[PDB]
Structure formats: structure tokens, C-alpha cells
Amino acid sequence: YDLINVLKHLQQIFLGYQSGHNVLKFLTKNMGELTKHYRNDNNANYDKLLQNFELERQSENPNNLMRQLLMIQFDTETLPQVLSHYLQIYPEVTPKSAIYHLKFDINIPYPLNIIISRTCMIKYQIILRYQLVLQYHSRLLDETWMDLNKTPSWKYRGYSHTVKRRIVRATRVLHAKMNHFIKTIMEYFNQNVIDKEVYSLEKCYRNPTLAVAIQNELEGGLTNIMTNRCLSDLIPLQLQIFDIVYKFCKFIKSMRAKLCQLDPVLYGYQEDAALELIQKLIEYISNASSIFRKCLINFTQELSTEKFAAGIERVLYSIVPP
């Protein structure tokens, strides 16, 4: 059965192992739908999502039985509310973005469902939903950096030498902090929990002796992941930061077209409505910076006072202030 290869493909699907490019492709082809409606709206026509997925699967490798069996689904429960059924977390405190409801699953064929049970499949699915949320916000900040360095409206040197700071410089600084936080959380997770458990499992089937031992290693790896702090205890604050970063990417996609009305490049015309816009943007940007700093100090304090790896110290080094 080449169970090593089946586990490799399952880790490529649900963990992201050696498969980051596939997740990035999925996001780029489906970036618009996973943020639409903040929900399934009146059984919204999210069948187009399934059609995109089947189109991609048509171009998938045929010898990869797992991706042939991968079924993209839209569960009616958000990832935090799904996590609340096993861990001591708290649900939302309104519809919330469609990727929070997106999920995957595989009807593992007999006999492979003897070792790859439904419990480890649920663990794979929840882990993949979390990884998709993280990679999705990372792609958001990637395309935000793209629009901040490819739209001449933002590269333009000007803005009264005061508006430039309080708008564009504060925007770029908050975006840089958001990017560093998100990328550092994803780095810590991927290469200190996910990688550790993949390596442990890989150590297990190096000349094993018991099928129950392999099942135990697999489930213990997935439990070490699902009980890890950043997946079981920091979930509410991660959700807060995720809402903040999504609102900020909305702000950036809006300013992309609403900023060309401020500097002479707009050629009312630099009337007091332009200055009202400018002041409103200053206030909203200070609002974003303030809420982000507050929630980030919250995150740091929940980090320091809890207990275990040093990847937590890396996260601190990333987010602690001077």
C-alpha cells in the first residue's frame, strides 16, 4: 500500500508539508470567495468554488489517491466554534469570513481507514482549516504589500510632508508589524510544531514493530498539534488579530482608489472634503494602530505567563516593543 506515501500525501493536503505552493495556488484562484458574504448567504452560489476545485483536481496527479478523494466542503460552524468542542476556548464575542467555514475531508478507503482513523482525519481537517486561515491572512498581507509597492498612488512622494507620515508611513509601519506578526506566528507553528510532529512520525515508521504503535504516533502527533498553545489557547487573540488584519487590508484596497483624490495627482479638487477625508484616515489609522497594540500586548502577556518551546521566545522577540 506504500503507507509512507499515503501519509506523505495526507500531510501535503492537511498539514501543508512540502505543499505550500499548492495552498498558495488554491488561495490565488479562490481569494475572492473565501472572504465573500462573511458566510454562506441564503445557500449562496458557492458551487463555483466546488467547480474550481474539481477543475484543479482534474489537473492533479492521478497516482495521488488522496487528492483524487479530497472533498472541499463548507461547514456551517466557524473554526473557533469547532475548536470549542474539544478545548477550553471561547467562541465569537455576526457572520465571519468564509474561510473560517471552509474545510476538507477524505473518505479514506478500506483498509487504509484502519490506521488512518476518523479521529486523526478530524485532526487533519481542523489543522488544515487553521493552516488555511493563517496562509490566507499571509496572502492578504502579501497582496497588500503588492498594492502598496505597485500602485504609484502609494509610492508617490508628496502629501504635504505631513499627510505622508500620518497616513502612508503609519500605514506602512502598521502593515509591516502585521506582516511580521503573521509570518512569525506561521513560522513558529509550521517549523516548531508541524515540522516536529512530521519528523516524529517519520521516525516512527523507520522499522516499526506494531500497527498500534504507528497509530499511536500519528494520533499523538496530531494531539501535540491540536493541544499546542497557538492552536488551543491563543485562539481568541489570534482571531482578534485576524479581524484587525482583514479590516486593514480592506482599508488598503479602499485607499488604493480613494487616495488619488488627495495630492495634485488628482488632476472637490483638494477642497475641504479632501482634508476631511485626510483627517478621517488619520483617525482610523490611529484606531487600527491602537487596537493592534492593545491586542498585541495582550498576546505577549498570555505568552509569557503560560508554560510549555523557544519558538514562543521567537514570537516574543518578534512582537515585544522597544
Binding site: 512540502q18 497582496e143 511580521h180
Partner: peptide, 21 residues
């Protein structure tokens, strides 16, 4: 080219590396 969990695009690398244009 040999992908891993994190950085599947030069966009991510540079967004990590480049604060402003």
C-alpha cells in the same frame, strides 16, 4: 522551487524584507 510550509512566493519574501518602496 522546493516548497515548504511558509514562503511560496517572492511576494512573501520581500514583504518580509521590504518595509516601503
Amino acid at each position: 522551487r522546493f516548497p515548504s510550509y511558509m514562503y511560496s512566493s517572492m511576494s512573501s519574501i520581500y514583504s518580509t524584507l521590504i518595509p516601503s518602496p
